[PDB]
Ligand binder design. Structure first.
Ligand SMILES: [Mg+2]
Ligand SMILES: [Mg+2]
Ligand SMILES: [Mg+2]
Ligand SMILES: [Mg+2]
Ligand SMILES: [Mg+2]
Ligand SMILES: [Mg+2]
Ligand SMILES: [Mg+2]
Ligand SMILES: [Mg+2]
Ligand SMILES: [Mg+2]
Ligand SMILES: [Mg+2]
Ligand SMILES: [Mg+2]
Ligand SMILES: [Mg+2]
Ligand SMILES: [Mg+2]
Ligand SMILES: [Mg+2]
Ligand SMILES: [Mg+2]
Ligand SMILES: [Mg+2]
Ligand SMILES: [Mg+2]
Ligand SMILES: [Mg+2]
Ligand SMILES: [Mg+2]
Ligand SMILES: [Mg+2]
Ligand SMILES: [Mg+2]
Ligand SMILES: [Mg+2]
Ligand SMILES: [Mg+2]
Ligand SMILES: [Mg+2]
Ligand SMILES: [Mg+2]
Ligand SMILES: [Mg+2]
Ligand SMILES: [Mg+2]
Ligand SMILES: [Mg+2]
Ligand SMILES: [Mg+2]
Ligand SMILES: [Mg+2]
Ligand SMILES: [Mg+2]
Ligand SMILES: [Mg+2]
Ligand SMILES: [Mg+2]
Ligand SMILES: [Mg+2]
Ligand SMILES: [Mg+2]
Ligand SMILES: [Mg+2]
Ligand SMILES: [Mg+2]
Ligand SMILES: [Mg+2]
Ligand SMILES: [Mg+2]
Ligand SMILES: [Mg+2]
Ligand SMILES: [Mg+2]
Ligand SMILES: [Mg+2]
Ligand SMILES: [Mg+2]
Ligand SMILES: [Mg+2]
Ligand SMILES: [Mg+2]
Ligand SMILES: [Mg+2]
Ligand SMILES: [Mg+2]
Ligand SMILES: [Mg+2]
Ligand SMILES: [Mg+2]
Ligand SMILES: [Mg+2]
Ligand SMILES: [Zn+2]
Lengths: 159, 218, 103, 104, 58
RNA sequence: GUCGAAUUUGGGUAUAGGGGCGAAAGACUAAUCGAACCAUCUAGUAGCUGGUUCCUGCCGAAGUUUCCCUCAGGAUAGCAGAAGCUCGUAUCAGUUUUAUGAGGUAAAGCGAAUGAUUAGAGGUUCCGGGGUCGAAAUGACCUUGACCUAUUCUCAAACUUUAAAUAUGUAAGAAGUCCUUGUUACUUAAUUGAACGUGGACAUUUGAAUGAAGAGCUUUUAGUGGGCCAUUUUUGGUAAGCAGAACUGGCGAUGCGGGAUGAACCGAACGUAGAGUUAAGGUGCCGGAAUACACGCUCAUCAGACACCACAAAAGGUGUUAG
RNA sequence: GUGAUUUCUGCCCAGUGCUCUGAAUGUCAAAGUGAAGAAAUUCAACCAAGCGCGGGUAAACGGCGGGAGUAACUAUGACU
RNA sequence: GAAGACAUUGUCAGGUGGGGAGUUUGGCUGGGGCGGCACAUCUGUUAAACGAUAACGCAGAUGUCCUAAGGGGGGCUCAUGGAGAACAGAAAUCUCCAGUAGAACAAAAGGGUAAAAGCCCCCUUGAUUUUGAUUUUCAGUGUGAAUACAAACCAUGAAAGUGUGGCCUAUCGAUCCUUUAGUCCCUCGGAAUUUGAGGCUAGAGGUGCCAGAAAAGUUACCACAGGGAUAACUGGCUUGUGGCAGUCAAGCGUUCAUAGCGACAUUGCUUUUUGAUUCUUCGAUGUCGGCUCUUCCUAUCAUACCGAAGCAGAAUUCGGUAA
RNA sequence: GGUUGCGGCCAUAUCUACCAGAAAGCACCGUUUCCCGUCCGAUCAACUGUAGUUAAGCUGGUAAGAGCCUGACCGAGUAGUGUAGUGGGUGACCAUACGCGAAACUCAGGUGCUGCAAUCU
């Protein structure tokens, strides 16, 4: 009859890539993970040990534990009408920093430096970002760029 | 014996082709797909016409058989067997399922209803789109009138509306008349037994040299 | 299956506390004795009229039984046991399997 | 409903037995096996057999069946006695006698 | 006498009637499941810190 | 039908209920019989049908998850009320933006893997089947087939290089950042690290948008666990006002204007009244509202007249009209 | 059980029953017997009927099959 | 007279005992039954590119097997093809070249694997112990399976490491009772010793209807509660099947398509066949057929009037207006 | 810049056929008493650096080279798709409004970069 195994309906989700089978380049293990890092989860079909269940594919969480060769992660899963926090244990292969924070800290440090240098002359640093403002008035000249006139096209079968 | 065609006029189910999973199908009625002087060169038949679809349907292999037979036989009887090259451009690859049920009087004692009503293969069909070619014919310009009439007489076997169009291409190539003509008067066109190969700008130079010699012999 | 007649394993014998040698024997039930609380209560209830009074089992479905080994430390002389998955055939005395031979 | 009435003959005793069951009762199905043993010199009423490898089975005791008598008769001139053994639930006896006198 | 077997109809509405609120957050989250070897150190570490501060502020 | 006998019949007497009696029908036993009548245990048990008696006000549902000899029933979770409690603009939001992830559907491809598929073209047999020349030859000619090479026509839910839109994860700060130096039995070749701290520095532009009707928390319990319809995606079937799913909105529980008529369609949701303007729909008359204005088409010896909606096709016509 | 008379009531005892065997390496309860133990108790050997095994029984319940070749036209099949 | 410590009688024990008593005789389901298991599970697809998602949907599989097919280490590289070597040939063994896996990895399929996860060799038992934490099904219970540490004892390798069964996704089991191992621990309640018994921790004995009752039929002599949640009539939707009608033209028709026919196709119509579903009725709509009686429909058998013919007349055929 | 050892990124780095390569380095290259492994000092082991050769490996270049990578108003704002209507059509299906937006194809360009340490006319 029906069937729901541990790895059901993952046939494409866990395929490795095109032209990328084989061992893994060492940079992944040369990474270093601190408690509190925000990390994305992408399964790697080559290492059956310590895989994440398909539901946690492509999700993002916060590390909370570190062991000899694996990592503890916290995820929020929507079950019923609430969220429950699940704790996972994953080998370092299905793991990679979400560079969202990598860039965000860049913004923060640049922000602080900007604030300080602006305060060096007291000039209202104006920190917050803005969405795309509507563009401004402007003049367009036609020198060597005389307007060119179009017209709709008649019809033919083109075969 | 054969269920009327109106029961399979539309595309109602996903394509269901014969494969290692089907393993029990009949054979399509259509076996010959290119007719006429098929060994003709490319260059002796410039004119080309198409029988194009203006619908979204399924065509029974039997219908293809009837149309092919009628069109071919007419084209032969009038214009001589070697004045055209006719070709079908579809293939029945979609299997059609049927739920065979007892048809005796008093079968109420045996029929079992739709309880377990998976079908059984009994006929093939081909799926066709708006703007897809069905029949393609190439011949000399002197026979446009006869060939177009043959195709018109052929449309009557197909369900739905189909147009007849005169392609502005040379033969079955992907080129229009003047472009092919200039390219052929230049050396970069070498015919093959049925189709034609084209000298390219890419490739290993001496290999291009060994063929198309007169093109380099400028 | 085939299982060696000897095996070296951790032995919690209050003297061993380290892997020691161990003979192996297959678990056997042991004779069901009277005077046990269950049996004697059951006899009391079965007495008198009423006929059968406790359920009797009919719908046997499994064909095999988990096999259980009986380990003893050759030094400390204490008995430990452990289990194996189901198997229709079991065998301790084993002619060790070979590869090169033909049919 | 639908029930089953069946008659089956005993494997070893040869007696005739029969019963009927509703078509849901699953009475036990015995497990048997044919082994293709070889017969050595016929000793006293026992039988003396041969594995493909071993010298075992001083068991089933030279079947008294009339085909057993025919086997005993055909034995004394030899010609490569082949036999089979049925061993349903331990109680076992030889059922079939056969010959491959090739040794070539 | 069949019976309609399964569906998720109206489940989304029935849920969103009350929020899908984020679970919660806190300082000092639970330490259950963390590396016990690390926990054993950390406990004595805090112990030593607290003793040092008490003796200093004394 | 039978009428001299296995005949008909009065009175007495015998047989009492799981018992009697039966020339045999499951018949008879006080109109009661495939288990008589009377009382009591007894208001017997019921997952099943029927009813359930005053007014107003406020809030307001489910026909779904899991387990059950469970399928007309329960438990559990979900949906609801009530009681409140701790605080007072927030650790919020069925939303967008910015930044950063994950995916193998639509589409597309087969002169790219797998599988299918039409046609010629060029080679290749110490090697296929042959025929012709030959006694044969690793001798020649034709033929069929194979095999290889470059092309060509067409496909896939259990194929795929590529790869959408819509849906979806995380972050956008004080629980932060920086600086200095304390603790440890952990770890490091090592005061190196790790983790938590001491102390100091940085505020309303404190780190996008918009809103916030307050925010958060706890109990406890009713009803519910037969659903149905519509657009869109979609499975079996020829189909169905059929059966089965996905997302959303409805109907049930709901009236009001319109579709004549109707649970679902269109508008729009309702305390009680007055005035004004509109929706969807209409403006010959029934009927409130222009026999308004304007450019064209059509004459039917079964015209045509409005979505869901209450049906018509392939094929034809010097009917007519414009191309 | 069958149903005047007349005329006949064929074959099968493998199965199920009934009956009759019990010389017997079959099986067995309670009582009793022997051994071990301080005792509770344990373990042995022994056993009636019955059953097992072996005959009779169909006016007892009942049952009473297939496949091939064959004769001078063919055909069939006395026959094997 | 007969019989005699035997009969008989009393109490236990085994046997026989539908004559009699009590009781049961699963669920799913396009009515129910027969059928099958969708009744616990696993692979791929249906599944609509997160997740979840039904059908007696599609293609399949499990109730096992393995002291190695586990663990570690080391060496090597496969399927296939070409070219050569006595017997030897399409196939034996040897050698070289090509070889991204086209092979193998217990088994179904799908992933994954090349100085390996494949093949061969060496050493071993981590298929061990102590209890926790976490993931999947989910109520965030259990069972199953799996993951990451901790504390010992180990194996392997020079070593870093690796190892808590099978490369990953399936291969399995509560309370009571019996039994085994551990502690040699607690208790037998007037106090002692020794048997015996009862307890704590951890396994085994099976519940496949697989979150787990112990269970054979018949009712046409039947009974009760109910059901239109569900069958047999009519009625409504659908038209496969049944019946009826066109479009096309290869041929038939001595010649010639249509005088009349008409293959291979294809578009419809009808509800007088039979299916298909289950909307209404199971507190009852009297269910075959015949008899009598009225009206209606047209797809016309005859009658009226016409047209056409392979229509001399005669006769006949086709067609139109027509109920 | 060349070369070597250890690498990162993993083809712009692979493959096919040719041509060149100072110095050093790498390499092929000589031998079998010992540790050691083989059917066989071929691989692996050990010793010499002496007897020789850049022939090969390796590096670099060459090809209207295959492949591979990048880009483009080339294809195409097409295919596809979110949202709307009492829009069209008997229907199959199709336009229209506000939005997002492919692949193939064509053309053009490119054919390894780089870290640590040592050594080199
Ligand atoms: Mg992927
Ligand atoms: Mg008593
Ligand atoms: Mg008793
Ligand atoms: Mg179901
Ligand atoms: Mg009767
Ligand atoms: Mg009476
Ligand atoms: Mg009452
Ligand atoms: Mg149950
Ligand atoms: Mg209910
Ligand atoms: Mg009810
Ligand atoms: Mg409940
Ligand atoms: Mg409830
Ligand atoms: Mg998919
Ligand atoms: Mg597609
Ligand atoms: Mg494509
Ligand atoms: Mg393919
Ligand atoms: Mg997103
Ligand atoms: Mg209540
Ligand atoms: Mg329900
Ligand atoms: Mg209701
Ligand atoms: Mg409403
Ligand atoms: Mg008003
Ligand atoms: Mg008026
Ligand atoms: Mg016209
Ligand atoms: Mg006794
Ligand atoms: Mg006896
Ligand atoms: Mg009874
Ligand atoms: Mg049922
Ligand atoms: Mg999904
Ligand atoms: Mg293995
Ligand atoms: Mg290895
Ligand atoms: Mg669990
Ligand atoms: Mg370890
Ligand atoms: Mg594993
Ligand atoms: Mg158990
Ligand atoms: Mg016990
Ligand atoms: Mg169960
Ligand atoms: Mg009964
Ligand atoms: Mg009945
Ligand atoms: Mg109904
Ligand atoms: Mg019916
Ligand atoms: Mg029909
Ligand atoms: Mg029909
Ligand atoms: Mg009718
Ligand atoms: Mg009905
Ligand atoms: Mg009724
Ligand atoms: Mg009534
Ligand atoms: Mg009536
Ligand atoms: Mg008419
Ligand atoms: Mg709307
Ligand atoms: Zn020990």
């Amino acid at each position: 009859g029906k069937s729901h195994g541990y790895r059901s309906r993952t046939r494409y989700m866990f395929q490795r890539d095109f032209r990328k089978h084989g061992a893994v380049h060492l940079s992944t293990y040369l990474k270093v993970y601190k408690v509190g890092d925000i990390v994305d989860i992408k399964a790697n079909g080559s290492i059956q040990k310590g895989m994440p269940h398909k539901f946690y594919q492509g999700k993002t969480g916060v590390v909370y534990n570190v062991t000899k060769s694996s990592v503890g992660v916290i995820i929020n899963k929507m079950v019923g009408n609430r969220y429950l926090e699940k704790r996972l244990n994953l080998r370092v292969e299905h793991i990679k920093h979400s560079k969202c924070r990598q860039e965000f800290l860049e913004r923060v440090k640049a922000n602080a430096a900007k604030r300080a240098e602006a305060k060096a002359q007291g000039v209202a640093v104006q920190l917050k970002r803005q969405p795309a403002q509507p563009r401004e008035s402007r003049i367009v000249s036609t020198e060597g760029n005389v307007p060119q006139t179009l017209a709709p096209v008649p019809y033919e079968t083109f075969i | 014996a054969r269920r009327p065609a109106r029961c399979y006029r539309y595309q109602k189910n996903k394509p269901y082709p014969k494969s290692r999973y089907n393993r029990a199908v009949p054979d399509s009625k259509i076996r010959i797909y290119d007719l006429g002087k098929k060994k003709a060169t490319v260059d002796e038949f410039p004119l080309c016409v198409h029988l194009v679809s203006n619908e979204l349907e399924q065509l029974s292999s039997e219908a293809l058989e009837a149309a092919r037979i009628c069109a071919n036989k007419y084209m032969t009887t009038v214009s001589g067997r070697d004045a055209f090259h006719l070709r079908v451009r579809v293939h029945p690859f979609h299997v059609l399922r049927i739920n065979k049920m007892l048809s005796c009087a008093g079968a109420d004692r045996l029929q079992q209803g739709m309880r377990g009503a998976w079908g059984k293969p009994h006929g093939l069909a081909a799926r066709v789109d708006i703007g897809q070619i069905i029949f393609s014919v190439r011949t000399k310009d002197s026979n446009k009138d006869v060939v177009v009439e043959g195709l018109r007489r052929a449309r009557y076997k197909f369900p739905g509306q189909q147009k007849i169009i005169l392609s502005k291409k040379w033969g079955f190539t992907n080129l229009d008349r003047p472009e092919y003509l200039k390219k052929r008067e230049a050396g970069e066109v070498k015919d093959d037994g049925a189709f034609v190969k084209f000298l390219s700008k890419k490739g290993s130079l001496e290999n291009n040299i060994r063929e198309f010699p007169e093109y380099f012999a400028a | 299956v085939n299982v060696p007649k000897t095996r070296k394993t951790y032995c919690k014998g209050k003297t061993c506390r380290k892997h020691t040698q161990h003979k192996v024997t297959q678990y056997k039930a042991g004779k069901a004795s009277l005077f046990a609380q269950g049996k004697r209560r059951y006899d009391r209830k079965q007495s008198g009229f009423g006929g059968q009074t406790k359920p009797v089992f009919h719908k046997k479905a499994k064909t095999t039984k988990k096999v259980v080994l009986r380990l003893e430390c050759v030094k400390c002389k204490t008995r430990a046991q452990l289990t194996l998955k189901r198997c229709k055939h079991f065998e301790l005395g084993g002619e060790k399997k070979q590869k090169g031979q033909a049919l | 409903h639908a029930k089953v009435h069946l008659v089956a003959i005993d494997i070893f005793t040869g007696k005739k037995l029969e019963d009927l069951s509703p078509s849901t009762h699953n009475m036990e199905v015995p497990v048997v096996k044919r082994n293709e043993y070889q017969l050595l010199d016929i000793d006293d009423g026992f039988l003396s057999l041969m594995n493909m490898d071993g010298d075992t089975k001083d068991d089933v005791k030279a079947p008294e069946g009339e085909l057993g008598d025919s086997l005993q008769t055909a034995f004394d001139e030899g010609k490569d006695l082949m036999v089979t053994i049925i061993s349903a639930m331990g109680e076992e006896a030889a059922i079939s006698f056969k010959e491959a006198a090739r040794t070539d | 006498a069949k019976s309609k077997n399964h569906t998720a109809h109206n489940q989304t509405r029935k849920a969103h009637r009350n929020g899908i609120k984020k679970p919660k957050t806190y300082k000092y989250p639970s330490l259950k499941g963390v590396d016990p070897k690390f926990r054993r150190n950390h406990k004595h570490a805090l112990h030593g810190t607290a003793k040092a501060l008490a003796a200093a502020k004394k």
